[PDB]
Structures are given as C-alpha cells and as structure tokens.
Amino acid sequence: SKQLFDYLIVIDFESTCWNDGKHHHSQEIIEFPAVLLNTSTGQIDSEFQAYVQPQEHPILSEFCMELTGIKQAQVDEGVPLKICLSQFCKWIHKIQQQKNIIFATGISEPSASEVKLCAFVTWSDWDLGVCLEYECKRKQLLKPVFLNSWIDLRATYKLFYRRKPKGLSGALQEVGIEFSGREASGLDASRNTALLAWKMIRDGCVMKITRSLN
Amino acid sequence: SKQLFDYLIVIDFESTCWNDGKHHHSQEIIEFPAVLLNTSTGQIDSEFQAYVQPQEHPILSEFCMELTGIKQAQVDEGVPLKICLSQFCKWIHKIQQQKNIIFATGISEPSASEVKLCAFVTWSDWDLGVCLEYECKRKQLLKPVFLNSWIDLRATYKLFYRRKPKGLSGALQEVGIEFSGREASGLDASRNTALLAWKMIRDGCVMKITRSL
C-alpha cells in the first residue's frame, strides 16, 4: 500500500476540566504535545511538548489532576497558550527545514523524493476542531492555519477495521497492543496514538484527510 | 424600568455525562426543556419538554441517571435530536401564532405595537454555545438560526448584582429565594431559572443579549 503523506504529526491535547454536574466553565489547554511519525520507517523522528499555563482558571481541579496526571507546578512553570502557539510554530518551522516537509493535500507535478507531505492526526475531531478552535476564537488568538485540516484517526479506524472502538484504549486493545498503568495523557497519549496509526499503516490503511474547517 | 423583550424562553439542557475515570468529549442532549416567561405579568404562559434519545452513547450511566434524575426508559421512549428540533420549532411556530412573537437581531428599542420581542435565556453560554452547537456540527444537523443569540443569565446576574454567585442555587439564595433538597434538573431547573429572571426584572434589571454567533 502506497501512503500519501510521508509524515504525520499526532496531537492529543490535555485541558482543564470539571465534572460538577450543571456547573460549566471555560476550558483551557494545559498540555500541547505533538510527535512526528515517519510513515515509511514507523519511528518518531521529533517531538514537541509544552505545558500551558491556564489564565481564566489557573488552579487545576482535583478531578483534572486525577484525569490528566499533570501536577500544579507544571502548569505554573508553563507558558500561556499564545506563547505556546509561537513555540509550536517554531518547531513546525524546524522540522520543515530539517525534513523538507510541506503541508499540502497533493503534488500536481511529478513526485520529487526531496519534498515530504505531512498531515495532522488526532483521535477525534475534538482536538483541532473543538478544543483549540473554540478557545482561540474566545481568546481572540491567531490560530495557525495549518491546524484547520487533519485526520480523524478514530473515524479512520472505524471504516478500516469495520468496528466501533471504545476509546483510544479500546482501539489499541482490539489490535493486541496493551499498555500498563493509568490511561496515558498528553505526550504519552500522542505517542500511543502514533503507534495505532503505524499499526494501521502496516495493515495497509492509507491515511487520508477527513475534516476541514475551510 | 422598561424591558426590551416581552417574552423570554429559558432553556436548561440535560445531557449524558460520566465519571468513570476516562476522557469524555462529546455529550448528547437527553432532555430539551423550555419555559415561556412573560416579562410583564411574571407568569409562565407556555412550556416545552422532550426527552432526547442519545445515539452515540444510548445507555445512560448510573452517574448520569442519578445527576439528571432521568431514567433509561425515558430516553428509550424519546425521539432523536433531529426530530426534537422539529417539535421545538412547531412549538416556536405555535407561540408565534398565539402571541405574535418575533426574533430579531440588534434590537435597540422595546416594541410599542402589536408585535412582541422574545429572546432565549440560558445559564452560562454552555447550552446554546457549546452543547447544542458542537452536537449539531458533529451530527451535521440543521440548527434553528434563532438559537444563535441568547442571554447569559449568569453573566447578567454578575454585572447587575455585582457579586459572584455559587451556581444557580447560590444565585437564588442571595436574592432571598431558597430551595431545599437535591439540585433541580431539566424542566424543573428551567422554571427555577425563569424564577430568577423574573426576580431580576423586579429588581430593575433590563435583560439584554449577551452572546451572538
């Protein structure tokens, strides 16, 4: 099976959250992880991780610290989301200059092996379609335009293996990949999502864009 | 004090929820309540209630059934969300045929004629700005355009009384309205939210649109 993208960037956001019934607050990203997956070798050639300091609700709840495993001192040393997006773009620009990566849906010219097509992968459409999207609009921040299209890996998992998975853990378990300890979060969840994408590629799944916000 | 809107429609959604240690992002509406408040008389002239059958997670968790008071058989008898908006629009169309209500944007003056201005009121922006909005966008359903602007009663309470309320119950307690027992849910919570809005009108608060999409 021939893949369209030479690299995927897998992202699994962690954010503030509460489950106190009908009290509803505004959620802010607290961890911004990304792993660069090589669709030809299967390895992780580069990683990005930044803890984001919340501004509207800077105190992490016990439910949130229990769910994400993130301690208070980590978001206290972290940077606001605005600075985080600048750091992430610097990382994107770095991996472009190193691996000759562009973000395109296809080359309308004969293929040149020097250029590499890359795409963003998330588990659900929640990361780049809900979490980062509706937070940038509410804080009037500039969202990088290359995060407006991605690959919903859960939807890709459903139509490929022809079954409905019960979360990222359930999907990994059904294909024989079992991890130990608590459910991964942040950079660990991103690495495991990239493992699932690599397993799907080995099984012959061609990763295609599933959602666009344009 | 002269009010801008002649009627308010108060909405307090109930939705699926879990507390099983896992990450949960998409919630589905399971109760669709709405009360029509008369801002001049103080009465509730009409009500709407529909139990919505969830599709992505049709089995209500025990944490959800306990928190909302909704039993599994009620959403089993309920209708999908798509059908629910059609019933809600028929109810909107019905109160239009009876009370001559219109929904208009950028209203800088109370109506002085036969036509009556109405607006939607919810506690916080979560109901019409997060819950219904994301669920319609992910399910590719057509959301009624008149649900694109509303009155955040929590924000209106904060800037009017100049104090931080501890939830809808905390807000009611601070204005002398005290309830006992479990936290209300669904249609009961909508009536209690409309009670708060009526008292705020009595204190002189002019209800204004706070959010528009």
Task: Compute how many other C-beta atoms are within 10 angstroms of the C-beta atom of residue B60.
Answer: 23
Residue appearing with tokens 């109405």: B118
Helix (H, G, I), strand (E, B) or coil at A137: helix
Give the whole-angstrom CA distance, residue B60 versus residue B27.
11
Q: Tell me which H or E stretch contains A85.
A: helix A81-99
Closest to B126 (Cβ–Cβ): which among A19, A24, A169? A24
Inform me whether the C-beta atom of residue A111 falls under 8 Å from chain B C-beta atoms: no
Whole-angstrom distance, CA of residue B123 vs CA of residue B117 = 20
H or E element at residue A119: strand A116-122
Detail the DSSP E strand segments found in A123-209.
Answer: 149-152
Tell me the β-bridge partners of A9.
Answer: A36, A120
Which candidate from B17, B124, B167 shows the least CB-CB separation from A19?
B17
CB contact A125 to B (< 8 Å): yes
Q: Report the gap between the CA of B154 and the closest CA in chain A (Å).
A: 11
* For B189, nearest residue in chain A (alpha carbons): A22
Bridge partner residues of B15 (DSSP): B29
Query: What's the distance, CA A199 to chain centroid?
Result: 17
**Which 8-state DSSP code applies to residue A130?**
I
Shortest distance between the Cα of B213 and any Cα of chain A, in A, equals 11
Within 10 Å of residue B116's Cβ, how many Cβ atoms? 19
A125-151: burial string, b at 16+ Cβ within 10 Å, e else: bbbbbbbbbbbbeeeeeeeeebbebbb
Residue by residue, what is the 3-state secondary structure of chain B? CCCCCCEEEEECCEECCCCCCCCCCCCCEEEEEEEEEECCCCCEEEEEEEEECCCCCCCCCHHHHHHHCCCHHHHHCCECHHHHHHHHHHHHHHHHHHHCEECCCCCCCCCCCCCEEEEEEECCCHHHHHHHHHHHHHHCCCCCHHHHEEEEHHHHHHHHHCCCCCHHHHHHHHCCCCCCCCCCCCHHHHHHHHHHHHHHHHCCCCCCCCEEC
Are the beta carbons of A8 and A194 closer than 8 angstroms? yes
Would strands A116-122 and A7-11 be described as parallel, antiparallel, or unpaired? Answer: parallel
User: What does the block give as tokens for A132?
Assistant: 């980062």
Burial (CB count <10 Å: 0-12, 13-18, 19+), residue A197: buried
Q: Which of residues 10-69 of A touch B (CB under 8 A)?
A: 19, 21-24, 66-67
Bridge partners, residue B51, by sequence: B31
- Does the CA dihedral A76-A81-A82-A83 come out positive or negative? positive
Under a CB-based contact definition with an 8 Å cutoff, are residues B151 and B209 in contact? yes
User: In Å, what resolution does this model reach?
Assistant: 2.1
Collapsing DSSP to helix, strand or coil, A214 comes out as: coil
Chain-centroid distance, C-alpha A78: 19
Question: Bridge-partner residues for B48, per DSSP?
Answer: B34
Annotate B85-134 with three-state secondary structure.
HHHHHHHHHHHHHHHCEECCCCCCCCCCCCCEEEEEEECCCHHHHHHHHH
Residue among A46, A41, A73, A47 nearest A60 (CA): A73
Beta B101-102 vs B116-122: how paired, if at all? parallel
SS3 A55: coil
C-alpha–C-alpha distance, residues B155 and A185, integer Å: 33
Q: How many CB pairs under 8 A join A and B?
A: 33
Which technique?
X-ray
Q: Are B117 and B102 in contact (CB under 8 A)?
A: yes
